[PDB]
Amino acid sequence: LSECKTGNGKNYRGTMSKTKNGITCQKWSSTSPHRPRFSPATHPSEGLEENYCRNPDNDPQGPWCYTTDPEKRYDYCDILECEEECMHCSGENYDGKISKTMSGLECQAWDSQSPHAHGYIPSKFPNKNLKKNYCRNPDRELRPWCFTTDPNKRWELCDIPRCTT
């Protein structure tokens, strides 16, 4: 479900399946080219599925996997950490905490219909993480935006900093 991690990623269940140097992960269920110490059979509650980066051993450096490079047993994956400071690109995956618009109006909460009735119902689009009243880009807008608490302005883009100047 969530393709980001919090903390050391013990509960990460995303679908990253490469390491941080781009090597495809080995399947946890496979014993070539590496024989795993952590496998679905031995550690069934750690979500060790396909070849997805996981943290079944509470490694302080986060999620990892056995690699398909015979000469490298395992390596850490490069996974996006949850929330923000900033947005990549146009904010398609922006899950940060800014909740006011360009003009400074406080956003209306996604799960509210006041002062603006709308169709962006969280339960309709759970994958879009329309959480509280945070700016989001569920629908390929220029940038994350929200509905506003100003009855006279239905919606407005937000001012989300770019991770790249």
Partner: peptide, 24 residues
């Protein structure tokens, strides 16, 4: 009737309405 088709109509409606409220 996919999710993404709905989101696209939703954006289109949001844009259209802003233009109409602009088009004093």
């Amino acid at each position: 009737l996919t999710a993404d088709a709905e989101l696209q109509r939703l954006k289109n409606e949001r844009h259209e309405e802003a233009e109409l409220e602009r088009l004093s």
